[PDB]
Amino acid sequence: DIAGLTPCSESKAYAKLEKKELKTLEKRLKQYEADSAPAVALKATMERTKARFANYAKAGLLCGNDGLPHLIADPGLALKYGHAGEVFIPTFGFLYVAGYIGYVGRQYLIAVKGEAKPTDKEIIIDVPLATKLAWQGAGWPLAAVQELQRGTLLEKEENITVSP
């Protein structure tokens, strides 16, 4: 109960919709023998389903008027009420991987311009070079903020313009 909401372990339309889905799976399950793999598959679907509802209520996800897990994307309402795993943890779990791919792709382009013809090595990726920058870019925020302090991250007004 943060913004008119309720815990999904406490709401009833959530549990009503769980019983709605398991009803649809079981009336689909009835057409098969109890040994048959079209019934082994559906009972494995249920145990993935029933554990999914158990795990969403375990994490304390917020339901509402429709009985669905609602997310809270604000720190200070997720840090305070124990919901940083909804948005506030994957907003840095993403931005680690995002700037990682950016930094590896940056370092591959920076370390290819001092060559004979760098356009050839954007077709033919230097795999012993590219994987070497791939592994060693794992501390990229530790390397970027040191490059941020110099002035070597931002190229100056050598950049190309039209008519300022």
Partner: protein, 41 residues
Amino acid sequence: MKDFTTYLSTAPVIATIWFTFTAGLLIEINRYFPDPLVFSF
């Protein structure tokens, strides 16, 4: 076969190997971790 490894190191071939890597990694994780809507512990 050095010329054959250049072909394996072109742009679309590394793209179709790395995308089978990255999808195939996320497929195996989403098998052994069924339905991660929220970061649990």
